[PDB]
């Protein structure tokens, strides 16, 4: 079938687990706890865009950092909503939590945000050509070494699904020394389901 995921291949050799803590004999419920907390932030902060979240379990008290740049408004006058969401987190996790927010510079070349973007104007009904083409030029203007974008599904032609891509530069997936960042997002429209995948090559790792 397909390839393996580049970042799944690169986990542990170039990439972090973003769950850096260790559990033993509480691994299970700890693990499903990281799943539902990720679900909570994912469908709460979907407006302000989140890419990835790192969970720390220092002295079993959970500790969170959240990435990306648009939550600069979450950091700002919305210290109240930061406190409220954190109160809901301690409502969900028993033992309390502490959260931090990390700004991301060049949020254009982060795969999660790219995929969420393409899913958004695919819901907003721009042509997939226009969406992919402006996004790819925006990333390689930002300084990415090479970007390939995917789309699949009923691309207007509901009677037969197909797939479309554009890519330039270099995207060496076969080289494990490369830094790759992968996203998938699922654009839902009246036609059914439209699939978005995107991955970014950003130079090698010495």
């Amino acid at each position: 079938g397909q390839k393996v995921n580049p970042v799944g291949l690169r986990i542990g050799v170039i990439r972090d687990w973003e769950s850096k803590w260790y559990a033993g004999k509480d691994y299970a419920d700890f693990l499903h706890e990281d799943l539902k907390i990720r679900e909570y932030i994912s469908k709460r902060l979907s407006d302000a865009s989140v890419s990835k979240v790192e969970i720390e379990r220092a002295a079993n008290r959970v500790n969170i950092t959240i990435h990306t740049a648009k939550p600069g408004m979450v950091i700002g006058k919305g210290g109240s909503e930061v406190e409220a969401l954190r109160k809901a987190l301690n409502s969900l996790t028993g033992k309390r939590v502490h959260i931090n927010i990390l700004e991301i510079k060049r949020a254009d070349l982060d795969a999660q945000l790219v995929a969420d973007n393409i899913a958004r104007q695919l819901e907003n009904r721009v042509s997939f050509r226009r969406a992919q083409k402006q996004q790819i030029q925006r990333t390689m203007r930002a300084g990415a070494q090479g970007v390939k974008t995917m789309v699949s599904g009923r691309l207007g032609g509901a009677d037969i699904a197909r797939s479309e891509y554009y890519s330039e530069g270099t995207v060496p997936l076969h080289t494990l020394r490369a830094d790759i960042d992968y996203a998938t997002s699922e654009a839902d429209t009246t036609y059914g389901k439209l699939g978005v995948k995107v991955w970014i090559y950003r130079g090698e790792v010495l």
């Binding site: 393996v4 995921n5 970042v7 799944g8 291949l9 986990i11 542990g12 050799v13 990439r15 972090d16 687990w17 973003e18 769950s19 850096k20 803590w21 260790y22 559990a23 691994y27 299970a28 693990l31 499903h32 990281d34 799943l35 990835k52």
Partner: protein
């Protein structure tokens, strides 16, 4: 008919045998792993996505 039976899974039955294991992230009754309480496809998804803090892809 999928979701009545997972309700049957969390709410307790009358005998110690009847607690058949399940994965609640994706409700497959077969092939869950006791170490994570999680079955195959929804294990592999989040495994490549980054969680399970110590899993790496084997090669020897």
């Amino acid at each position: 008919a999928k979701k009545s039976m997972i309700a049957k899974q969390q709410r307790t039955p009358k005998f110690k045998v009847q607690e058949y294991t399940r994965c609640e992230r994706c409700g497959r009754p077969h092939s869950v792993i006791r170490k994570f309480k999680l079955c195959r496809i929804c294990f592999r998804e989040l495994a490549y996505k980054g969680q399970i803090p110590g899993v790496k892809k084997a090669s020897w």
